[PDB]
Motif scaffolding. Structure first.
Motif, PDB file in Angstrom:
ATOM      1  N   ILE A   1       7.313  -8.118 -26.493  1.00 44.85           N
ATOM      2  CA  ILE A   1       7.985  -6.863 -26.540  1.00 44.85           C
ATOM      3  C   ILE A   1       9.075  -6.575 -25.488  1.00 44.85           C
ATOM      4  O   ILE A   1       8.837  -7.009 -24.449  1.00 44.85           O
TER       5      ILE A   1
ATOM      6  N   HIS B   1      11.944  -4.382 -23.773  1.00 46.06           N
ATOM      7  CA  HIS B   1      12.286  -3.006 -23.773  1.00 46.06           C
ATOM      8  C   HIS B   1      13.553  -3.146 -22.929  1.00 46.06           C
ATOM      9  O   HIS B   1      13.661  -3.304 -21.775  1.00 46.06           O
TER      10      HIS B   1
ATOM     11  N   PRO C   1      16.764  -0.755 -22.974  1.00 45.84           N
ATOM     12  CA  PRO C   1      17.917   0.219 -23.047  1.00 45.84           C
ATOM     13  C   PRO C   1      18.886  -0.005 -22.306  1.00 45.84           C
ATOM     14  O   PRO C   1      18.849  -0.378 -20.962  1.00 45.84           O
TER      15      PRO C   1
ATOM     16  N   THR D   1       7.247   1.457 -20.500  1.00 50.40           N
ATOM     17  CA  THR D   1       6.785   0.711 -21.255  1.00 50.40           C
ATOM     18  C   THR D   1       5.153   0.692 -21.098  1.00 50.40           C
ATOM     19  O   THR D   1       4.617   0.700 -20.038  1.00 50.40           O
TER      20      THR D   1
ATOM     21  N   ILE E   1       5.700  -9.676 -22.162  1.00 51.84           N
ATOM     22  CA  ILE E   1       6.385  -8.452 -22.074  1.00 51.84           C
ATOM     23  C   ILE E   1       7.733  -8.256 -21.051  1.00 51.84           C
ATOM     24  O   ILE E   1       7.451  -8.456 -19.978  1.00 51.84           O
ATOM     25  N   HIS E   2       8.760  -7.880 -21.458  1.00 53.62           N
ATOM     26  CA  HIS E   2       9.839  -7.796 -20.881  1.00 53.62           C
ATOM     27  C   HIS E   2      10.508  -6.316 -20.859  1.00 53.62           C
ATOM     28  O   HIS E   2      10.917  -5.721 -21.631  1.00 53.62           O
ATOM     29  N   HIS E   3      10.343  -5.593 -19.576  1.00 51.83           N
ATOM     30  CA  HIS E   3      10.995  -4.464 -19.392  1.00 51.83           C
ATOM     31  C   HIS E   3      12.210  -4.716 -18.607  1.00 51.83           C
ATOM     32  O   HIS E   3      11.991  -5.035 -17.368  1.00 51.83           O
ATOM     33  N   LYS E   4      13.475  -4.484 -19.181  1.00 51.25           N
ATOM     34  CA  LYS E   4      14.541  -4.830 -18.477  1.00 51.25           C
ATOM     35  C   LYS E   4      15.896  -3.791 -18.872  1.00 51.25           C
ATOM     36  O   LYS E   4      16.796  -4.024 -19.365  1.00 51.25           O
ATOM     37  N   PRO E   5      15.534  -2.523 -18.491  1.00 48.70           N
ATOM     38  CA  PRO E   5      16.357  -1.494 -18.677  1.00 48.70           C
ATOM     39  C   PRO E   5      17.814  -1.539 -17.751  1.00 48.70           C
ATOM     40  O   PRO E   5      17.520  -2.195 -16.764  1.00 48.70           O
TER      41      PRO E   5
ATOM     42  N   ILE F   1       8.739   2.332 -15.359  1.00 48.51           N
ATOM     43  CA  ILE F   1       7.183   2.176 -15.271  1.00 48.51           C
ATOM     44  C   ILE F   1       6.987   1.216 -16.378  1.00 48.51           C
ATOM     45  O   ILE F   1       6.919   1.429 -17.664  1.00 48.51           O
ATOM     46  N   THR F   2       6.143   0.115 -16.053  1.00 49.77           N
ATOM     47  CA  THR F   2       5.534  -0.603 -16.827  1.00 49.77           C
ATOM     48  C   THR F   2       3.983  -0.543 -16.682  1.00 49.77           C
ATOM     49  O   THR F   2       3.536  -0.837 -15.689  1.00 49.77           O
TER      50      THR F   2
END
Lengths: 73, 73, 73, 73, 73, 73, 73, 73, 73, 73
Positions: free
Chosen positions: I23, I25, I27, I56, J23-27, J55-56
């Motif tokens: 996954i 995310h 933006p 997320t 899981i990659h949260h890279k806004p 927020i992850t």
């Protein structure tokens, strides 16, 4: 001699009921009368003499599955 | 001689009921009368003499699955 | 001689009920009368004489699974 | 001679009930009368004479699983 | 001669109930009468004479699992 | 006045799907412009004014069951 | 006045899915402009004004069951 | 006045999924501009004004069961 | 006045998932600008003004069961 | 006035998951600007003004069960 026995069974037996309803079993009475004198039973004899059976059997499903698998060699 | 016995069984037997309802078992009475004098039972004899059976059997499902697997060699 | 016995069983037997409801077992009475004089039982004899059985059996599911596996060599 | 016995069983037997409800077992009375004089029982004899059985059996599920595994050589 | 006995069993037997409800066991009375004179019991005889049994059995689940494993050589 | 309410529902709602494929949501952009002076909002009043929504919703099954029961008197 | 409420529900809502594939949510951008002077919001009033929502929702099954029961008197 | 409330619910809500795949949420950017002078918010009033939401929600199953029971008198 | 409340719930809510995949995310950015002068907020009033949320949420199953029971009199 | 409250709940809420993947949260970044003069907040008033949230949230199962029971009189 090579024997491979690999039958496959993915079957199902099912039942469903909304309701079974009211069951009323109210038989009248009775008599069983037996006269005998000499009784001789030998070698794997199975029996009953003189009986009255009042049976109510109401299973909420009573499905049966029987399997016999045999290999003789 | 190579024998491979690998049957596969993924079956199911099921039942469901909303309700079984009211069951009323109210049989009248009775008599069982037996006259005998001499009784001789030998070698694996199974029996009953003179009986009254009032049975109510109401399982909430009574499914049965029987399997026999045998290899003779 | 190589024998491999590897049957596989992933089966299930199930039941569910919303409710079983009201069960009323109210049979009338009775008599069992037996006359005998001489009784001789020998060698694995199983029996009952003279009985009255009032049985109410209401299991909340009574499913049965029986398996027999045998190898004779 | 190589024998491998490795059956696999991942089965389940289950039951569930919302409620079993009210059970009323109120049979009338009775008499069991037996006349005998001479009784002779020998060698693995199993029996009962003269009985009255009032049984109420209400298990909250009574499923049974029986397994027999035997190898004869 | 190599024999490997490695059956695997991961099975389960289960039951659940919301409630069992009210059970009322109120049978009427009775009489059991037996006349005999001479009684002779020999060699593994099991018996009962003359009995009245009032039994209420209400287990909160009474599932049974029986396993027999035997190797004869 | 005797009122009995006992509806029964044993229904099912289901779905199965092999894969969800390839879903591409790639809309272009946009402008939303709202101009006003005086806003008077009272008593169970709701509004959504001036918005851009890019929504991708891909549930792996999203079935719904809606229910309701009521009695008045 | 005798009122009995005993509805029964044994239903199921289910889903199965092999994979969720490849989902790409790649919208372009945008502008939301809102201009006003006086805001008067009172008594159970709610609003969403001036927003940009980029939402990806991919539940691996998201079934719903809604229920309600009521009686008045 | 006799009131009996005894609804029964044995339902299930379920889901199964092989994998969740590859999910890419890559939206472009944006601007939200809100201009006002006087804000009067009172008594159960809520608002969301001026926001940008980038939300990825991927539950590995997110089923819901909602329920309610009520009686008045 | 006799009131009996005894609802029964044996339900289940479940999910299973093989993996959660990949996954991403990612933006782009943005600007939120809010301009005002006078803020009057009173009595159960809440607001969110001027925000950027990058969220997320990937629960490994997030099922919910909501329930409520009430009686008045 | 006789009131009896005895609801029964034997339910379960569960989940299982093989892995949580990658899981990659890279806004990207951003700006939030809020300008005002006078702030008057009173009596059960809350606000969030001017914020950036990255927020992850990845719980390894996060199921919820909510419940409530109440009686009035």
């Amino acid at each position: 001699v090579q024997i491979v026995y690999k039958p496959v069974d993915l079957s199902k037996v099912t039942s469903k009921c909304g309701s079974l309803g009211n069951i009323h079993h109210k038989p009248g009475g009775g008599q069983v009368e037996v006269k005998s004198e000499k009784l001789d039973f030998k070698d794997r004899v199975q029996s009953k003499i003189g009986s009255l059976d009042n049976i109510t059997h109401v299973p909420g499903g009573g499905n049966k599955k029987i399997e016999t698998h045999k290999l003789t060699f």
